[PDB]
Ligand binder design. Structure first.
Ligand SMILES: Nc1ncnc2c1ncn2[C@@H]1O[C@H](COP(=O)(O)OP(=O)(O)OP(O)(O)=S)[C@@H](O)[C@H]1O
Ligand SMILES: Nc1ncnc2c1ncn2[C@@H]1O[C@H](COP(=O)(O)OP(=O)(O)O)[C@@H](O)[C@H]1O
Lengths: 341, 323
């Protein structure tokens, strides 16, 4: 009884911010995974639906973060693979069995402990079907993962005969960033616009928001993207993430220990100078961040773009003990204040 | 070994509201396997195969009839898609995986296709119908056994039955003017669709976009017109693998009781029909509702029963709890 859905959401809140709905979904699926394996196929209900996860969100939304923060809190091992280096037919790039090999290294070759492990994959969009231009990075890779997800056994050389390791009990988290998916959903939901007086006048973009647009997604929508329907059928769960809120970004710069403010703060403390960031400058940065349409990953651009001149002349400058950054410095047409003595 | 009456009852256990479709597949599959038990040894040499064509809305149980039938009959079965230049070899090797790469056992298997109307009106559009013609008549395709020998196994395609599933859009207008009446625009002229589909003929399919050569190979026709609102409730109650029974069984091991009143199930029918997706878009309504309850249920203690009301589906109210 180690995992608690009410507690697992509290722990992720410490390392992740801005995604409340997605955290609830993972707690249910994760709890249902071990609840099932506690009594495997012994209940009266036969043909129980398999529990998997499908993370869908924009860039910098925290998809990769949930996979890492979850493994730290969790006891069973965790792996972080990628679909970009995967090939088929034993080519020079990589094989699907490598994911099972890396799992044992984390578990020290414990099959009983490895079957209860977690799996995570990034950049699932790369394996999306494409028209013929041979195409090895595509449908072929999906077939290997499909038979692997549906439950089977794969030969694994122990320590480098082969060992059989069932996979119907192992969890899989296929997650990545889908590009152009919003356009596909728009065609289905928009259904045109009226032109007369009584018609619903449309502005430039009243629905171009991942939130309220991805929640209405369906499995058939992903088929047009390139994925196989049978592959999606094995993942009934879906997790829709929204673009980070401007207020949420502020919290990322203050509460997390790895905040960019704390990073540059220590960067100048070793140099013998203090640093400060007022609240009026944080919200201003959030306005510029959303305009870039990159997420928290593209937040560092606004910071270094401002402190470029300051850092250039700080080592040469002497007798400077503290630096204060005003809101005008971020908007422009101003210079950060410097403290001497 | 089975009979049309015996197989009808088994199908009834997992499927409901489609009576005519059961008799079609029963006699078809019965006579289909009869040819395998006795081939050209009889006077009737070269017994031809009779393909099957399913027509119904989306989420109308088209896939379940093929999937459930496969479980009942101890033979392999795969699922194909009209989306996948020819790209027809993937369907053969996909079947050998379940059959453990067997020639004779696979040859008696069945295959299902979805969205067959998506190609009717280019190598991915009308070019697919032309290619299938030989596949639905008989041929052999190279399939690497085990992936690799430098050899390939031959697997005929005359013994493998095909079921082209899909949902035709706008077909009702074509048959109305041809058979029932030419109307819809005039004053006196008349402005469920199921009854019309029963009177369907291949001539109407030609105007839809299909090729006559393609339709000739599928003389059998099935009409999965619609699913009733009560049937949806029955779908969650009569089948042993219903989702309502799954969640009930999920909490049985937890030591908590579950309930689902009839006043709450009818609301699910409205949301299903509102999405125009059928039974496929059902878990989204249930899982989205019980997400809150499941999230805090383990944390909560001294709770032996849970009741879900109609308001709970909307989300305005909270599911009643029992201590
Ligand atoms: N919810 C979040 N809360 C706080 N910081 C976040 C959040 N999401 C992203 N970040 C920041 O962005 C960095 C990268 O997070 P990722 O999980 O990689 O974002 P991502 O959208 O998952 O990237 P991809 O495209 O999935 S690889 C983290 O190290 C944080 O600094
Ligand atoms: N008559 C029915 N009885 C029981 N379940 C049904 C029925 N019709 C549809 N379903 C449900 O729908 C799902 C399959 O939908 P499917 O046939 O794949 O939709 P589509 O035909 O649009 O692909 C199954 O999980 C099944 O339980």
């Amino acid at each position: 009884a180690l995992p608690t859905p009410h507690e697992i959401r509290n722990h992720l809140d410490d390392y992740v911010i801005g995604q409340e709905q997605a955290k609830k979904v993972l707690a249910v699926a994760v709890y249902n995974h071990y609840k099932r394996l506690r009594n495997g196929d012994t209940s009266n209900g036969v043909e129980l639906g398999k529990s998997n996860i499908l993370l869908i969100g924009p860039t910098g939304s925290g998809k990769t973060l949930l996979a890492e923060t979850l493994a730290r809190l969790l006891d069973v091992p965790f792996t972080m693979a990628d679909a970009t280096t995967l090939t088929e037919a034993g080519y020079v790039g990589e094989d699907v069995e490598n994911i099972i090999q890396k799992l044992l290294q984390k578990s020290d070759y414990d099959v009983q402990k490895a079957q209860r492990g977690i799996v995570y994959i990034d950049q699932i969009d790369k394996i999306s079907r494409k028209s013929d231009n041979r195409d090895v990075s595509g449908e072929g890779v999906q077939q290997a993962l499909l038979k692997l997800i549906e439950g089977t056994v794969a030969a694994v050389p122990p320590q480098g005969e082969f060992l059989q390791v069932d996979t119907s009990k192992i969890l899989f988290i296929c997650g990545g960033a889908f590009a152009g998916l919003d356009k596909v959903i728009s065609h289905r939901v928009e259904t045109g616009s009226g032109i007369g007086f009584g018609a619903t006048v449309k502005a430039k973009s009243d629905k171009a928001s991942e939130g309220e647009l991805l929640a209405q997604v369906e499995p058939e929508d992903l088929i047009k993207f390139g994925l196989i329907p049978e592959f999606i059928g094995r993942l009934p769960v879906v997790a829709t993430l929204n673009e980070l809120s401007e207020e949420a970004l502020i919290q990322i710069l203050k509460e997390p220990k790895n905040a960019l403010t704390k990073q540059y703060q220590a960067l100048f403390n070793l140099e013998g100078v203090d640093l400060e960031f007022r609240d009026e400058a944080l919200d201003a940065i959030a306005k510029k961040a959303m305009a870039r349409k990159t997420g928290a990953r593209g937040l560092r651009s606004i910071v270094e773009a401002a402190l470029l001149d300051t850092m250039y002349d700080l080592p040469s400058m002497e007798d400077v003990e503290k630096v204060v950054i005003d809101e005008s410095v971020i908007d422009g047409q101003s210079e950060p204040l410097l403290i001497y003595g």
